[PDB]
Amino acid sequence: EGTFLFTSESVGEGHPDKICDQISDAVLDAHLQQDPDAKVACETVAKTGMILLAGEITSRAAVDYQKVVREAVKHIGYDDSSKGFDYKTCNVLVALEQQAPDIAQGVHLDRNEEDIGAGDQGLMFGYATDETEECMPLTIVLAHKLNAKLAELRRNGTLPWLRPDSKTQVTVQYMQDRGAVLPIRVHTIVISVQHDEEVCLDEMRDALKEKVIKAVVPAKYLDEDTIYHLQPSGRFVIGGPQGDAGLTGRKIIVDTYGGWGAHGGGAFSGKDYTKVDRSAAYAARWVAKSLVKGGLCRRVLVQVSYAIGVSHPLSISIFHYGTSQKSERELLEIVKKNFDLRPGVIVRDLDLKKPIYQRTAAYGHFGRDSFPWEVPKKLKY
Amino acid sequence: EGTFLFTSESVGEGHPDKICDQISDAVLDAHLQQDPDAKVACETVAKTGMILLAGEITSRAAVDYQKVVREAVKHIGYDDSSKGFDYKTCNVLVALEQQAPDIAQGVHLDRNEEDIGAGDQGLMFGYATDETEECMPLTIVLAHKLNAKLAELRRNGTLPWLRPDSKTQVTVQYMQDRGAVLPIRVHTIVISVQHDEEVCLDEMRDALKEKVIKAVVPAKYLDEDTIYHLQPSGRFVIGGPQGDAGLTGRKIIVDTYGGWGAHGGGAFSGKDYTKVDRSAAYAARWVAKSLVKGGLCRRVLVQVSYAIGVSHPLSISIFHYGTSQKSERELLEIVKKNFDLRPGVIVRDLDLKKPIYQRTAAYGHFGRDSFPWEVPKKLKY
Amino acid sequence: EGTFLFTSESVGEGHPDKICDQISDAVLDAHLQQDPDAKVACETVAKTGMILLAGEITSRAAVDYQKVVREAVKHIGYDDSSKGFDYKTCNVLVALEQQAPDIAQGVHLDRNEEDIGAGDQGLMFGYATDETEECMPLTIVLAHKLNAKLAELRRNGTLPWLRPDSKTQVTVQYMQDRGAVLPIRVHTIVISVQHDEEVCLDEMRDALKEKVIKAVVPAKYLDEDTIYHLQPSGRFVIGGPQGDAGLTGRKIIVDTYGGWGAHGGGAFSGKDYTKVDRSAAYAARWVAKSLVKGGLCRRVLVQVSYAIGVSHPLSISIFHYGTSQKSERELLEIVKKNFDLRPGVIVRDLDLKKPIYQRTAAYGHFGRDSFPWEVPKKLKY
Amino acid sequence: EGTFLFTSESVGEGHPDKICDQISDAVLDAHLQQDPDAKVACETVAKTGMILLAGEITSRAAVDYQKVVREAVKHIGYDDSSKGFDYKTCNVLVALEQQAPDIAQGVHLDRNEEDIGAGDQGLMFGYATDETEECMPLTIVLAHKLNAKLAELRRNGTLPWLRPDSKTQVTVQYMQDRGAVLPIRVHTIVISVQHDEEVCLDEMRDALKEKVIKAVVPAKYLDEDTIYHLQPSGRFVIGGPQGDAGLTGRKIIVDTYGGWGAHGGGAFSGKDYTKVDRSAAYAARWVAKSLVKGGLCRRVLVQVSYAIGVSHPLSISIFHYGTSQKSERELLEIVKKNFDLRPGVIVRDLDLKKPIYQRTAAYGHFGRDSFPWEVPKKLKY
Numbered sequence A, B, C, D: 001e002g003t004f005l006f007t008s009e010s011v012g013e014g015h016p017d018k019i020c021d022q023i024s025d026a027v028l029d030a031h032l033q034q035d036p037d038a039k040v041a042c043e044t045v046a047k048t049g050m051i052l053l054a055g056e057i058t059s060r061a062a063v064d065y066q067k068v069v070r071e072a073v074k075h076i077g078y079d080d081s082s083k084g085f086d087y088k089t090c091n092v093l094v095a096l097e098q099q100a101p102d103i104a105q106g107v108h109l110d111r112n113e114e115d116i117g118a119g120d121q122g123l124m125f126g127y128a129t130d131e132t133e134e135c136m137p138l139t140i141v142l143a144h145k146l147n148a149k150l151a152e153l154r155r156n157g158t159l160p161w162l163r164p165d166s167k168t169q170v171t172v173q174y175m176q177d178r179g180a181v182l183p184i185r186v187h188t189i190v191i192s193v194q195h196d197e198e199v200c201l202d203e204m205r206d207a208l209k210e211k212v213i214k215a216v217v218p219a220k221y222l223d224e225d226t227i228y229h230l231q232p233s234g235r236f237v238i239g240g241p242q243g244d245a246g247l248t249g250r251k252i253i254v255d256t257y258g259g260w261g262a263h264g265g266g267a268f269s270g271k272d273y274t275k276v277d278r279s280a281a282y283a284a285r286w287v288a289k290s291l292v293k294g295g296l297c298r299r300v301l302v303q304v305s306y307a308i309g310v311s312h313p314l315s316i317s318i319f320h321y322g323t324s325q326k327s328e329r330e331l332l333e334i335v336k337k338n339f340d341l342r343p344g345v346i347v348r349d350l351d352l353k354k355p356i357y358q359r360t361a362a363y364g365h366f367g368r369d370s371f372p373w374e375v376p377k378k379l380k381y
């Protein structure tokens, strides 16, 4: 009584879906470096030996897709056929067209920037919670940090048997204080990570407990009853796109709040700011974080929605879980007085023409690195 | 005060992401018709003139991928280059391998069926709400029905200018009664639908209001202040994969609860029952619907999670929004007494080897057609 | 006694192999329009709904591959799914990389143009015969003209049931005068041409005899014993890449001399002048035609060969079939005194940086249009 | 005076065009092992990290394309990303359809086997020459043996720095005796072969002269004036499909007579016996070799041609270069009395349903291994 379990997951940089997200954002950044107004909707698919780029780009940039893609795969760490994938020798296929003129004319052609229409219809959510300093659920924060630690240990040579493809999952036991949530302990941790053929299972499991989990999880959350599922499959030599097809926008919950809050369904990666799936979700996080860091609530969910070609949101909704003294209608009035959620204004407030998107494409878009949507707005009311 | 807006969206059968979901499930069904134990993880990508199949299948079935894919595209209604895509003449590319042996050995090889391991780690949610007879949010129910009506009118020749690619979005104004939600009115409707070159915009907008919206939305929810954004882009001749790349599992919120409840991130389409992203999400809906139709609550969210190779769930969580007299811990005990959420048991309870998955792949997986996960379990406690 | 049969074939513009040749040369021309020194090795593959570009290009040009490819397919006449292929709606996939640096450094980097090395090893032949004014075998000349007539009648609407995919084959009865050949009559003609579903076979066969064959073949060569195989398959509705995969460089005998003379194996299309498969074969035709039009022989075959990185030919050989009063060694001395067969000199003599290559890619590279290799050199000796 | 040069080339097993030929024939053999009447027209394209299969197959066989393709690449020796290509990790894409019904009905449906129609129109040549025991030109025989020696030394570890991609070219000085040709000496040899990064150029050139050339070329043909172009590019580390796109049927002169004789343009690899490009070219070699080994001539060229759907050849022509006492018309009568060149009879005489085609796909189809078309027919006249 009083307590509940909640589970979130994360994946590593070499997870095949995350490879695609990073590639799509490497392509977007490559365009934005030359043409800040590039319209980009780049999807990536990865399978054994293949990166395929599909989608719509209208840009003045001259982009060497072979170079951009292969350098992103190189950074991930897939550089030899022994690892199952190699940037030097894989197939890069490109099926990219111009943005449809019907779309262009409906959304941005001949518009003043501040009044550009939403690039599509859709709904988007932002969330924030005071349970961590990052204003993110602990479950997802820990899941991400476990994967980041694996990559650190791989890249510094502490654990040279590690590969790039990894998944993690953290279940935390919580209690609730008046609609806010308070983490008590880590209940279960799962880690699966691709490895070389020479390392034995007990060495891997020992290292994952001692060098990864204990290096990442605050000791106050771990106890003798914590359940560890470390390399639970027994063997994970084949990995990366060879083991499992990857697509852009197939880790949208990993990218956001790990099951907490809500999601409107739109992927982030490979999309420029006129795609409100990305710009308005970023803005909504910025709103949610601003409400919490401003002391107006402890936990909050923000919904916004759009129609293609229409610049203002169709709806805005605030849910505070009972964690404010203000009514949800009062918070909504405060949001409406302080934020302009048109895509052509968000772009200016969050500096969304800057080529920083590849950095967002692993370890979550929120809760790290003081990106502009992570810097709270000082609210007037 | 008292009221809030909530928005959900749906897409039609010819939306490019939904084309991929249907194709992936057409491939899964084709395998299951010959081999009930087929292991299938089929991703589809669609772009101008191309369907590519990527992923992992181990099966005794002999499947003609050209036929399966082209017949699915035919059923959708893409049968002429005038529509932007044609089943007769498009490229079908196949990049399908066996399931990795490391995965096979970790999950199912040499196991008794009831004890097969989860096919992957992950988290999943089920939701139900008493606001409609289907136990689904009204916003998403209406969004789906609008798209189904467009397809009906297209296929019966009432509106021969319609094409297969459509999107809809419904914003409802709600009030809340003790954690349950009560729809009051439709606030905003968006409809975008691909059309022929000859029909003018006013004829389209008139037909969408009179023949679609008024045929679908109960008149009590529509009033003089309802906002209509009908063909808001102005022109939507290019559509289907020519206008926008499609991928499997890029409509996961449309597939489920339209933003309500929560989502764990896993796509459904192209996956057999050992993939708990599908089987355990279906089971969780079945749990949630059983709790509501059993009179134990008005609204409920269920989380479950798994580790690869481990048959029992790692966590189960019940959230009732305050709509039960029973505590969440009591509901959890009732769930645990009445359901066995191992994938190898769910498969038997929900008959998940049957080739009915193509039917799930448009208009939502939940709230329609009395699929087995939509038939409440009589609970003992 | 005294007489022999000889057969050659040609194909139309919409034959799938010829589609690829035209596309590859459309890509080469697109580069050369912006960058005269572009290094291009572009292979094309065509199958139902797909054009794939594969190969190596290093160029300063910015080329819109989608536009270039689709416009070439448009010119061919594949513009509706009813025809089996449509430029508007097919898949264009691009798998193009830079020229390998090892190759670049071996062949052209840091060289004076006149001394660039051959771009590869290989052997090449040129041929000419005085039997026609074009200095080409009659069999191949007639085969080409039959296909050109089909395209004319298709494009002017005389025969609107015609499609773009066609093949023709002509067998001529010859006699020999002292190593020269003298055509006597057409023995057999084959024509297969893709057609619409509505035209009946007898109408097609009547039109092919009356409007095609009689419009093209000089009446002196046709007689009552000439054999006609017109639509010999009975039905040819499915055609173009839907019926048969196409690749660049799979019509190399159609491109040259129809079985007469000899061939060294190198394709022409998609290659810039540093590829001696194209430049030295063109030069060798130019030599052969110059010998014949200069009155030094009636019929002649020229072989040249190269090594990668080496500018001068490794061998030059002249075969006159007994049709000269000069010995083959004397003709060789005349060739060596009058031509410089280094690729960096040929490029200047034949103006091979000019973007005229798409025009070469159907109906043969030789015997038509007064291209520079078809204008005889005045010989000094 | 009296003498002439002639040049031919060959390529190794790992040359990218030859990789495609071998793969296409590996696919054909895989079908024929299960279904002797399989209709196969399989084209392969190779580029960095990619094997794509395109074409038309109608067969009762169940063929695992991933396995067939990857095993062929393995046999070639591309097994690590250090070599530029790896069977374990490359992309295999499949775009294979059924044979068009229009073609099937025109050629073979409902026909007695002996009377099946030619699978296409086309012309084909056979050649034989008494200059070697294999009845092949010395230039091409030597070119092939040089590549076979490189592969031997690579596979036995004598030269571990060798890779699979190689090209060779041999120029021989000949004299002519009454239309026959008599080799006098090797004039020039070119060898280019892919190599590891660690071996220096002088070590490679020394080994190519001493361990390859001197092991293959009879010493009587080599002298102090022979020209050697060994690794003439200077550096050949990048090779295989990474360096140069490969397609099936782009080595048709290497496959046949190295420039001698003539060629009708049809590729061999990936085609079953109903494709007369392969069956009738094999038959024509068999005719030519039978004439020479029967003492009827020293050197001979045979042309045959076909129409789609027509079983008998449209033309047969014999050219003896003046090397027979019999007239060409008498040789033709002897051929017509002794051979039945219908595809449905050739299949029986040459046993063309047997899965031996992968063995034909490198080092030439003729002049080796006592294949049935290399075993002379005893002629009656």
Ligand SMILES: Nc1ncnc2c1ncn2[C@@H]1O[C@H](CO)[C@@H](O)[C@H]1O
Residues within 6 Å of the ligand: A015, A016, A017, A165, A166, A167, A192, A193, A233, A234, A235, A236, A237, A238, A239, A240, A243, A244, B100, B102, B103, B106, B120, B308
């Ligand atoms: N043998 C394995 N054990 C555990 N996880 C794996 C294994 N192979 C792949 N995975 C992970 O799970 C995902 C789905 O198969 C892959 O993307 C990969 O990250």
Ligand SMILES: Nc1ncnc2c1ncn2[C@@H]1O[C@H](CO)[C@@H](O)[C@H]1O
Residues within 6 Å of the ligand: A100, A102, A103, A106, A120, A308, B015, B016, B017, B165, B166, B167, B192, B193, B233, B234, B235, B236, B237, B238, B239, B240, B243, B244
């Ligand atoms: N011109 C248009 N107007 C409105 N919606 C469109 C248009 N073109 C495409 N869409 C829809 O929006 C999605 C994203 O571009 C497409 O999948 C399609 O369903």
Ligand SMILES: Nc1ncnc2c1ncn2[C@@H]1O[C@H](CO)[C@@H](O)[C@H]1O
Residues within 6 Å of the ligand: C015, C016, C017, C165, C166, C167, C192, C193, C233, C234, C235, C236, C237, C238, C239, C240, C243, C244, D100, D102, D103, D106, D120, D308
């Ligand atoms: N039904 C048919 N009849 C005759 N020729 C055809 C037919 N279908 C295709 N072809 C031609 O022959 C080639 C090989 O199938 C094709 O490229 C096409 O040009």
Ligand SMILES: Nc1ncnc2c1ncn2[C@@H]1O[C@H](CO)[C@@H](O)[C@H]1O
Residues within 6 Å of the ligand: C100, C102, C103, C106, C120, C308, D015, D016, D017, D165, D166, D167, D192, D193, D233, D234, D235, D236, D237, D238, D239, D240, D243, D244
């Ligand atoms: N650096 C090189 N030097 C010599 N030959 C090469 C080189 N790179 C590729 N080749 C060969 O020549 C062909 C055309 O580039 C390739 O298929 C390969 O066999």
Ligand SMILES: [K+]
Residues within 6 Å of the ligand: A123, A124, A125, A126, A262, A263, A264, A265, A266, A281
């Ligand atoms: K969202």
Ligand SMILES: [K+]
Residues within 6 Å of the ligand: A244, A245, A246, B041, B043, B055
């Ligand atoms: K997958």
Ligand SMILES: [K+]
Residues within 6 Å of the ligand: B123, B124, B125, B126, B262, B263, B264, B265, B266, B281
């Ligand atoms: K879920």
Ligand SMILES: [K+]
Residues within 6 Å of the ligand: A041, A043, A055, B244, B245, B246
């Ligand atoms: K998209």
Ligand SMILES: [K+]
Residues within 6 Å of the ligand: C123, C124, C125, C126, C262, C263, C264, C265, C266, C281
């Ligand atoms: K040639």
Ligand SMILES: [K+]
Residues within 6 Å of the ligand: C244, C245, C246, D041, D043, D055
């Ligand atoms: K073909």
Ligand SMILES: [K+]
Residues within 6 Å of the ligand: D123, D124, D125, D126, D262, D263, D264, D265, D266, D281
């Ligand atoms: K031939």
Ligand SMILES: [K+]
Residues within 6 Å of the ligand: C041, C043, C055, D244, D245, D246
């Ligand atoms: K090539």
Ligand SMILES: [Mg+2]
Residues within 6 Å of the ligand: A017, A245, A246, A247, A250
């Ligand atoms: Mg995935």
Ligand SMILES: [Mg+2]
Residues within 6 Å of the ligand: A120, A121, A122, A265, A266, A277
């Ligand atoms: Mg969306």
Ligand SMILES: [Mg+2]
Residues within 6 Å of the ligand: B017, B245, B246, B247, B250
């Ligand atoms: Mg989408």
Ligand SMILES: [Mg+2]
Residues within 6 Å of the ligand: B120, B121, B122, B265, B266, B277
């Ligand atoms: Mg998942």
